[PDB]
Symmetry: C2
Subunit: 174 residues, 2 copies
């Protein structure tokens, strides 16, 4: 789309929304919830945000390596100044909510949201055939600091937690 | 497109994608999808095929699948040999949905109707999701088929509807 590609120095695009079921402190997978709209453009205009897209909830690489790496380093991400971590995929809000609960996330440390119809991912050119790509975006006070996509199957070289922590460290405010 | 009717043969060449249960309920461990030959499975015995609009969605979770789980023994007393839940969600999501509901074995299988291929072929899909419907088969012959068009209702596809039609057999 017109936003494609996102590059450092760009503002995060306007009018970006995701659908999600807010966490409640409970990990009960049989409580489905009720989706609401998350205004990502407003949220990302203040503070430091990490936005990670994965091709699919509950799929092997996304589960076994990608999301678990971020979960293991949530203390380091917080100490590096990250105010919010967002995981998106094309799966609907109900599936994304179950995926976060399956990974033990009961609070706002990581939100799990749906990029409905890959609207956002397609706008920045990183979607295919109904699924988002695997990518990571770091934003600070509305400004894209980092945006990279993993095109190699099974790799998190560019969108994994280590790449994000490296970017944060190069900002010079540790 | 006329629907599946009692007395019709169950359609040929119906296949789903699914991850075979292992006995583990760990949702962070996934297996490898394989094909499930539903036409062959349904050619013998009594089978119940239930389509839901989405794994983990409120009616499907809180009312629909839980009813079949709670009354599994009643279904077996009526001679039910297979219970299959399908949706357009991929096999990884369907596998996790089965585990979320505590199903460790093949008593209820959770399979993907990839691209709503089967549901579309019988006129019960829309916009990338299957409808909410149930099909009861005995030895390859449909004995019941109906779809729920009222949001939130399992009147036509819920376990009570299935138990009733089996009780009239």
């Amino acid at each position: 789309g017109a936003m494609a590609p996102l590059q450092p120095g760009d503002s995060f695009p306007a009018n970006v929304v995701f659908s999600y079921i807010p966490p409640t402190g409970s990990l009960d997978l049989t409580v489905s919830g009720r989706p609401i709209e998350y205004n990502a453009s407003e949220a990302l205009a203040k503070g430091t945000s990490v936005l990670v897209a994965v091709p699919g909830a509950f799929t092997p690489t996304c589960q076994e390596k990608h999301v678990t790496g971020f979960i293991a380093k949530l203390d380091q991400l917080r100490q590096a100044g990250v105010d919010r971590v967002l995981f998106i995929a094309s799966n609907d809000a109900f599936v994304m909510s179950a995926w976060g609960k399956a990974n033990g996330i009961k609070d706002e440390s990581i939100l799990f949201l749906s990029d409905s119809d890959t609207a956002f991912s397609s706008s920045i050119g990183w979607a295919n055939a109904g699924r988002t790509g695997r990518y990571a975006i770091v934003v600070k006070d509305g400004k894209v600091v980092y945006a990279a996509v993993d095109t190699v199957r099974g790799s998190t070289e560019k969108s994994g937690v280590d790449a994000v922590l490296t970017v944060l460290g190069n900002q010079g405010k540790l």
